Design a protein around this motif. Structure first.
Motif, mmCIF file in Angstrom:
data_model
loop_
_atom_site.group_PDB
_atom_site.id
_atom_site.type_symbol
_atom_site.label_atom_id
_atom_site.label_comp_id
_atom_site.label_asym_id
_atom_site.label_seq_id
_atom_site.Cartn_x
_atom_site.Cartn_y
_atom_site.Cartn_z
ATOM 1 N N UNK A 41 -12.681 -4.925 -2.007
ATOM 2 C CA UNK A 41 -12.654 -3.802 -1.009
ATOM 3 C C UNK A 41 -13.321 -4.744 0.359
ATOM 4 N N UNK A 42 -12.773 -5.051 1.595
ATOM 5 C CA UNK A 42 -13.290 -5.858 2.348
ATOM 6 C C UNK A 42 -14.269 -4.676 3.363
ATOM 7 N N UNK A 43 -13.548 -3.853 3.796
ATOM 8 C CA UNK A 43 -14.250 -2.638 4.148
ATOM 9 C C UNK A 43 -14.429 -1.560 3.388
ATOM 10 N N UNK A 44 -13.207 -0.576 3.414
ATOM 11 C CA UNK A 44 -13.087 0.590 2.440
ATOM 12 C C UNK A 44 -12.028 1.378 3.020
ATOM 13 N N UNK A 45 -11.507 2.078 2.090
ATOM 14 C CA UNK A 45 -10.156 2.764 2.511
ATOM 15 C C UNK A 45 -10.852 4.137 3.131
ATOM 16 N N UNK A 46 -10.769 4.214 4.329
ATOM 17 C CA UNK A 46 -10.978 5.621 5.145
ATOM 18 C C UNK A 46 -9.830 6.500 5.548
ATOM 19 N N UNK A 47 -10.475 7.807 5.549
ATOM 20 C CA UNK A 47 -9.136 8.881 5.603
ATOM 21 C C UNK A 47 -9.630 10.058 6.368
ATOM 22 N N UNK A 48 -8.606 10.756 7.335
ATOM 23 C CA UNK A 48 -9.150 11.622 8.061
ATOM 24 C C UNK A 48 -8.886 12.915 7.224
ATOM 25 N N UNK A 67 0.890 -1.135 0.009
ATOM 26 C CA UNK A 67 0.118 -0.140 0.000
ATOM 27 C C UNK A 67 0.806 1.119 0.066
ATOM 28 N N UNK A 68 0.527 2.214 -0.830
ATOM 29 C CA UNK A 68 1.330 3.527 -1.135
ATOM 30 C C UNK A 68 0.594 4.726 -0.897
ATOM 31 N N UNK A 69 -0.420 4.761 -0.125
ATOM 32 C CA UNK A 69 -1.021 5.751 0.311
ATOM 33 C C UNK A 69 -0.219 6.437 1.413
ATOM 34 N N UNK A 70 -0.831 7.405 2.192
ATOM 35 C CA UNK A 70 -0.408 8.056 3.327
ATOM 36 C C UNK A 70 -0.512 7.154 4.737
ATOM 37 N N UNK A 71 0.339 7.571 5.708
ATOM 38 C CA UNK A 71 0.199 6.821 7.052
ATOM 39 C C UNK A 71 -1.096 6.949 7.802
ATOM 40 N N UNK A 72 -1.787 7.870 7.246
ATOM 41 C CA UNK A 72 -3.127 8.214 7.918
ATOM 42 C C UNK A 72 -4.259 7.393 7.236
ATOM 43 N N UNK A 73 -4.131 6.955 6.212
ATOM 44 C CA UNK A 73 -5.133 6.064 5.432
ATOM 45 C C UNK A 73 -5.272 4.463 5.975
ATOM 46 N N UNK A 74 -6.536 4.009 6.067
ATOM 47 C CA UNK A 74 -6.926 2.649 6.473
ATOM 48 C C UNK A 74 -7.529 1.921 5.562
ATOM 49 N N UNK A 75 -7.576 0.634 5.453
ATOM 50 C CA UNK A 75 -8.398 -0.159 4.833
ATOM 51 C C UNK A 75 -8.022 -1.784 5.040
ATOM 52 N N UNK A 76 -8.933 -2.467 4.613
ATOM 53 C CA UNK A 76 -8.929 -3.921 4.417
ATOM 54 C C UNK A 76 -9.549 -4.593 3.300
ATOM 55 N N UNK A 77 -8.640 -5.416 2.691
ATOM 56 C CA UNK A 77 -8.850 -5.891 1.296
ATOM 57 C C UNK A 77 -8.965 -7.315 1.291
ATOM 58 N N UNK A 78 -9.638 -7.922 0.362
ATOM 59 C CA UNK A 78 -9.905 -9.423 0.447
ATOM 60 C C UNK A 78 -9.164 -9.924 -0.965
ATOM 61 N N UNK A 79 -8.178 -10.513 -0.802
ATOM 62 C CA UNK A 79 -7.503 -10.993 -2.168
ATOM 63 C C UNK A 79 -7.631 -12.349 -2.205
ATOM 64 N N UNK A 80 -8.071 -12.914 -3.230
ATOM 65 C CA UNK A 80 -8.373 -14.396 -3.401
ATOM 66 C C UNK A 80 -7.792 -15.140 -4.866
ATOM 67 N N UNK A 81 -7.783 -16.417 -4.680
ATOM 68 C CA UNK A 81 -7.060 -17.178 -5.829
ATOM 69 C C UNK A 81 -8.362 -18.301 -6.001
ATOM 70 N N UNK A 82 -8.796 -18.365 -7.113
ATOM 71 C CA UNK A 82 -9.725 -19.166 -7.623
ATOM 72 C C UNK A 82 -9.320 -20.432 -8.583
ATOM 73 N N UNK A 83 -9.226 -21.420 -8.071
ATOM 74 C CA UNK A 83 -8.645 -22.491 -8.823
ATOM 75 C C UNK A 83 -9.564 -22.752 -10.085
ATOM 76 N N UNK A 84 -9.253 -23.312 -11.441
ATOM 77 C CA UNK A 84 -9.959 -23.156 -12.431
ATOM 78 C C UNK A 84 -11.504 -23.881 -12.434
#
Lengths: 252, 222, 238, 238, 222, 60
Positions: D194-201, D120-137
């Motif tokens: 997006x698991x939740x969302x990128x929240x920012x102050x 993640x290359x945003x600022x230290x103040x940003x937050x977020x949860x992401x779901x990254x998945x792999x689906x077999x064929x």
């Protein structure tokens, strides 16, 4: 006696009062994939009792003029409960099976069936060179039938019984796991097929691992009995079913 | 033993390539490696469903001067190049193209008058055994290619004369022999009864079980 | 250089040679082996397996499957013949296309005993005794049950055990016979006769079928690899 | 001379042969060896090193560097998809030109697990949860986060540790897949949601970039040396 | 392994020389040894900054009779001489000059119809490793030659027919193959992306990172 | 290759030579041997046997 037999998988039990033995693959009992034989890295699901249980397909009638039938696996089980559901949600699957073919008559009836499981039963078209569709060989638990006459319909497979749809001699199908139901002695046949393939796991829709064929070598015959047809029922239970590569369900 | 039954070199392919011709394609051979075009070898392998073995490959190359009105010439000995292009590698479009550099693909340079060229290839399948048959499709849909051809992706063999342009054309014929060794075979099948019709499909024309005799008791010849 | 001298045979290409040769794909990493069921090591393992013999391969055949059915009927004349066949496992039409005959056709010599298994396929209510015999070669084949019973035979009784095995022994002057059998290499005849008769109670079919299987015994072997007469072509396929 | 006989293969030039040959500079005194840093012994050592994956290799690309930046923004609709890619490390445009893809392109077979590292290359103040998945064929790729979460996945939380590793396991019917991948040799899909969302102050940028690195695991290997489709020429250079 | 990746013979050069011609230079080849003219080998070596290895050199020489109106002749087998001239040694100006005596330079005499000529050369650099790149100048001034070419002084290879003057011209083509062995490599670099333009310079034409697709989510083929 | 040098006699076919050569029928299974009476090992065994001499081989 040994004729008595009882088999329990999951919430189902099968019993037979007049059987032969139980044929087991090429002497190989079904078994889960070992770590030293695997490629697919994800943790598999092994539903156990929910999938490894007995499923009874639609029955069929054996009449004096019947010629033979076939069912392709796993296709034949694609709609059976959670076994079918797991087939749909996964890219890869693997399983062995206990096949129990049932057929009771009477001490006054005569007839004899060959019950065989042919691995990779690749078939020829009714007209050489003409391609046919999947529907010409399998569709759920629908029984397909062989014919005496040679097939003319190009949308079909070459169904002439004596060549078993494979271009070989039907009397040589005995090199594949089989059992005979001779009405005079049997009343059922049980064959346990292990997983046989050139790769550790495979897609269950795209590849028919083996085909079950039930062929009357000696025609059904009887005298002045009120019974006419003799039903044939196939009950099969997946064994050691495991799946990999979960994703969205395949529409069909 | 299966090792012995399969272990004899058999011709699996043959083609001609000219030393000089106006047609670019007549001057080199491009063959998609397979074992289904020559009937004898095919029938033998097809007696088993799965096979696993190493492969000894021998090439027999012969040349003849094309007939014509003026044949007098004095051509030095010919040298041929046989290159194996694994699936995906650059394919030569003409005898003189860059691809023939073989910095990585394996090639054999052989000169006429000598012992036939030969080499061994190990078991190269991506599967655990080679499949002679495949009752299935390429697409998950149950569409696309049907049959063993969908699993055939062993690459190509390309052959040309090295710098053999002659004043009057010379035609070379290459014959490739396969001899499986260190063999293992699984799930045997009935031998092919019907004659083969296609290189890449099981397709056939119904053929009777066997030949007939006058009656069920006939045992004499005349 | 080390002084050498080429001998005859130098530079030739013998199809059945067994030499080493350079590998065109140096250091190719072979796909790992996998233990597939059903490995075959010798073609004799196949020839040792039963296949259905088309004994009733008669002229007027309408339906191909009839070739596998040997007819047997009620009220047959006493001592009647059921069938007769000549022992040329690689040449006679009755055997040439069976598993055993097909394997034999890739060789020129053969030796050993054979198993002819007969299975009765009538109802459980039918009964019968049959005499199945093997006659070593001689100028004349047996024409009567009396003639047949002087040779190697077995008397088959029908009961719970539906099948019976006539094992034809290797009786020959030579150690091996030719697949392309001739008079010198003659093997004899196998014939079947009614010992008593097929008796039946009321309400059962009047005739039934018998099937014949054939396979090699453990003393059987083949020699001299050769191409088979059963496959050919006029053109390259495609 | 010693009697000898030439066998087939004699006089041929096989490119991958491995024989000895006379040295044209007899007794040449080689320059002494020196211990230079960074010795490579196996090409897999290179494939095991991370390289930046051009995940955002979209059609309308104006600026080339944009291909390395995966967009992530505030107030994204719930369960929204961030990206989706198909696992063909040697064939798909997203991977074919990375270190791993380039090495794969000199071979025809591959096998093993892969590491996809996301930073993640945003600022230290940003937050977020992401779901990254792999689906077999399977017949169909996941179209929704609900579909995706049924496969192999990891839920990434942003904090001091900026990077997260999705390790895609080797799940295949065959031991090896083809570099020139086909349907039979299909490997599946990798998707991000997006698991939740990128929240920012207050006072921080509204969108940020995520980068993706790829490398091979220790169970990875390639087979069957072949020429690469990525380089060619019409003429000798000069 | 690097030994395996680099250890296959690759064509690094090829040229023709005639048996008889009016032009003195058309009758022999003079090649300044280098590994930058044939694209495949070059790209492989260039994946490393420094390399140290022994070298196996194999030559493939083939001859063809030039086309013409009168081709009838009966020429005996041809013999070629390949001579290596270390930097500074006398260079031949014509096929028949004194320099071909090779009292000290290494030469190979080879006759057609035989196995291709071959020999090994040890690691001959004056440095501790061969440099594939050199970001610098020849002069202390920071002038003169720029680049790897300033470190290339491996000498030349000269080849001629021995006493092969034929009535009608014959053209021979020599192909030289290099196979590094007993290899060591240091500081690996990104593979060359842009096509090569010059033999003695890194020079290139900007080429895009990779090929494009319609959007960042496109994952289908059609 | 190992350096070699052909000597005179190379490639010739001497009728009474005694070299090895490739077998055209690899792995052919020979018919078992049988002990037939009267084996001969040396032609002198024959010359050691009496035969009737035509001593009276006269003109008429």
């Amino acid at each position: 006696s040994d004729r008595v037999r009882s088999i329990t998988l999951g919430n189902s039990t099968i019993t037979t009062q007049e059987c032969a033995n139980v044929v087991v693959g090429y002497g190989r009992w079904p078994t889960y994939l070992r770590d030293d034989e695997a490629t697919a890295e994800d943790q598999p699901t092994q539903p156990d009792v929910a999938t490894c249980r007995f499923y009874t397909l639609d029955s069929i009638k054996w009449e004096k003029g019947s010629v033979g039938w076939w069912w392709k696996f796993p296709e034949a089980l694609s709609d059976m409960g959670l076994f079918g559901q797991n087939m749909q949600y996964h890219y890869l699957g693997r399983a062995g099976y206990t096949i129990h073919v049932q057929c009771n008559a009477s001490k006054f009836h005569q007839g004899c069936l060959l019950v065989v499981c042919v691995p990779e039963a690749e078939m020829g078209g009714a007209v050489v060179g003409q391609a046919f569709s999947a529907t010409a060989m399998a569709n759920g638990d629908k029984a397909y039938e062989f014919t005496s006459a040679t097939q003319s319909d190009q949308t079909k497979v070459q169904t002439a019984i004596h060549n078993a749809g494979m271009g070989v001699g039907v009397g040589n199908l005995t090199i594949y796991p089989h059992q005979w139901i001779n009405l005079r002695t049997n009343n059922s046949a049980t064959i346990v097929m292990p997983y046989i393939n050139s790769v550790p796991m495979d897609n269950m829709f795209r590849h028919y691992n083996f085909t079950l064929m039930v062929i009357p070598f000696v025609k059904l015959d009887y005298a002045d009995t009120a019974s006419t047809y003799v039903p044939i029922t196939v009950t099969v239970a997946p064994m050691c079913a495991e799946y990999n590569g979960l994703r969205l369900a395949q529409a069909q | 033993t299966v090792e012995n039954f399969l272990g004899r070199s058999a011709c699996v392919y043959m083609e001609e390539y000219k030393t000089t011709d106006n047609d670019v394609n007549k001057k080199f051979v491009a063959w998609p490696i397979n074992t289904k075009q020559m009937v004898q070898m095919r029938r033998k392998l097809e007696m088993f469903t799965y096979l696993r073995f190493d492969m000894e490959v021998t090439f027999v190359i012969t040349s003849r001067q094309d007939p014509g009105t003026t044949l007098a010439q004095d051509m030095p000995v010919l040298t041929h190049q046989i290159m194996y292009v694994p699936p995906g590698g650059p394919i030569p479009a003409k005898v003189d193209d860059y691809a023939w550099q073989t910095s990585t693909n394996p090639s054999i340079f052989w000169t006429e008058g000598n012992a036939p060229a030969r080499m061994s290839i190990p078991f190269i399948s991506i599967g655990n055994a080679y499949s002679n048959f495949y009752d299935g499709w390429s697409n998950f849909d149950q569409r696309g290619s049907y049959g063993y051809n969908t699993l055939n992706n062993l690459g190509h063999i390309y052959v040309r004369h090295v710098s053999g342009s002659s004043p009057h054309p010379i035609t070379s014929t290459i014959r490739v022999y396969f001899k499986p060794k260190h063999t293992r075979a699984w799930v045997p099948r009935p031998p092919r009864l019907c004659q083969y019709k296609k290189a890449f499909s099981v397709d056939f024309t119904p053929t009777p079980i066997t030949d007939t005799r006058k009656d069920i008791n006939t045992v004499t010849t005349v | 250089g080390l002084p050498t001298m080429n001998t005859p045979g130098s530079t030739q290409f013998l199809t059945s040679d067994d030499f080493q040769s350079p590998c065109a794909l140096p250091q190719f990493d072979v796909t790992p082996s996998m233990n597939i069921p059903g490995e075959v090591k010798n073609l004799m393992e196949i020839a040792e397996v039963d296949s259905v013999v088309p004994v009733n391969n008669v002229q007027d055949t309408t339906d191909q499957m009839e070739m596998f059915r040997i007819p047997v009927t009620i009220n047959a004349p006493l001592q009647q013949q059921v069938f007769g066949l000549r022992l040329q496992p690689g040449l006679d039409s009755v055997f040439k296309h069976t598993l055993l005959g097909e394997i034999l056709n890739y060789y020129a010599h053969w030796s050993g005993s054979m198993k002819l298994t007969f299975v009765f396929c009538g109802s459980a209510m039918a009964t019968g005794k049959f005499l199945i015999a093997y006659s070593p070669p001689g100028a004349n084949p047996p024409k009567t049950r009396k003639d047949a019973m002087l040779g190697t035979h077995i008397i088959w009784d029908i009961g719970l055990q539906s099948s019976c095995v006539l094992c034809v022994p290797w009786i020959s002057q030579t150690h091996y016979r030719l697949v392309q059998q001739d008079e010198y290499t003659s093997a004899g005849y196998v014939t079947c006769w009614y010992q008593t008769g097929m008796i039946v109670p009321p309400g059962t079919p009047n005739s039934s079928s018998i099937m014949c299987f054939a396979s090699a015994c453990n003393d059987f072997s083949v020699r001299m690899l050769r191409d088979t007469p059963f496959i050919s072509q006029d053109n390259k396929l495609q």
